[PDB]
Design a protein around this ligand. Sequence first.
Ligand code: HEM
Ligand SMILES: CCCCCCCCCCCCCCCC(=O)NCC(=O)O
Length: 454
Amino acid sequence: KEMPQPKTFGELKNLPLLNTDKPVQALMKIADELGEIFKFEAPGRVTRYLSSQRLIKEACDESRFDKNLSQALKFVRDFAGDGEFTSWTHEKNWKKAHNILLPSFSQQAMKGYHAMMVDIAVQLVQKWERLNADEHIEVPEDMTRLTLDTIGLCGFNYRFNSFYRDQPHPFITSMVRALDEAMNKLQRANPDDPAYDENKRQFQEDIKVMNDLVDKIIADRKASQSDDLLTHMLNGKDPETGEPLDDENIRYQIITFLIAGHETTSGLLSFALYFLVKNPHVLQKAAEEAARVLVDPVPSYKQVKQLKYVGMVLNEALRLWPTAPAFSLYAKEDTVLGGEYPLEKGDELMVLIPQLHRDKTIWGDDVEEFRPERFENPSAIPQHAFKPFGNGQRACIGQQFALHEATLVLGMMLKHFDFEDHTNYELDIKETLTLKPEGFVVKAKSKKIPLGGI
Ligand code: HEM
Ligand SMILES: CCCCCCCCCCCCCCCC(=O)NCC(=O)O
């Protein structure tokens, strides 16, 4: 079968279709028009975008495809290096990092992070209880304060103190600019036009800000007994090789985990709150569970694990708007995809996750509705139908960290406040490679339930 392909622009082929501030949403619209697979060509590069579970399940076969660095991740690698997110599976530092850092995500480790996650969640609840009657909440802004603070504290014993700042933390400002520039470089046909000189200067200055922060984390740790993610980065030995990470790689890991470890989580909490306010009956169910389950002044680790419906709400937000919305594969050898599409060794595929999650042959016709009951019995969901955390040995290492944090915080929010979508907010999804609502504001009325000490 010949592969569908969207409209072209002469010798720029499909490239100018990425000349938009919302490229993923543009690709989703193309997949809607063109179907489960389409080709996207740019000068000197081709990729194929997959949207159906039937083809994505094949792409998820690790004997035939391996993780690829999409052009977006190659640009991120300019500041994330061979950190765990932007390394190739065949690079020595990927498996060594994965082996050294995995223990930081064990259940025993998670039980150990719980108190520090509560410390930050209590700061969030206190900030909102302290608002005056005439004020409102800027949701994605506060969720980024919470999630950055939480990976800082749990992962690095470092306080960003983001709730002490009315503007974004300077790491956030540089990170966002750096991910923005990566996204913007995707549609640049001549990246070395001197018209991009100031883009390049500003990129370097952004990277220097992130690395100065990494310096402070490393120095604060030297000056400081912890056993956290940074402990394993600095001292952990890979059981296979017996070697620890080198200093250069360790700096890439800290940048990696500070970014990967909070940005997508902030997106998830923002979208879950959005869907809750837009679906009052769902919000009533979740708030009922939070009140029934969270009987103590602050939540315990077991209580969080008991918030089943809140967990379903977060999964159903990840179904509609997975906040790292694509991952890319390459063919290990020549092969035929779906019995219809021949690929040569090295050909790249991109999995368009929001489109996979709207495959009506899996989910039924009502894929746009927000229905957490979809996830009541997760074992009934077909393999490779639901993939917000990527695939196989390159799947997200921090998936349980993110879900525990989001479930704890959303459970505390729902216990402590009633929420009003006071402006009838129209969803506007800002892209910086990752997805988050922009402009989403709410009002929160305290239920005046006292909050225990940290
Ligand atoms: C809801 C929140 C999250 C989402 C949706 C998410 C999504 C993903 C996805 C889609 C990938 C695969 C990327 C690819 O194949 O190119 C991935 C990998 C990764 N994520 Fe997450 N992530 C989240 C939270 C986290 C957190 C909290 C951490 C750290 C504490 C983290 C650290 C990582 C790392 C280090 C990788 C690379 C894993 C490897 O290849 O060894 N992520 N994530
Ligand atoms: C260092 C940790 C990095 C954390 C952020 C990771 C970003 C997640 C990637 C999301 C996918 C973005 C898709 C961008 C649009 C697209 O398809 N571009 C084509 C291409 O990238 O080559």
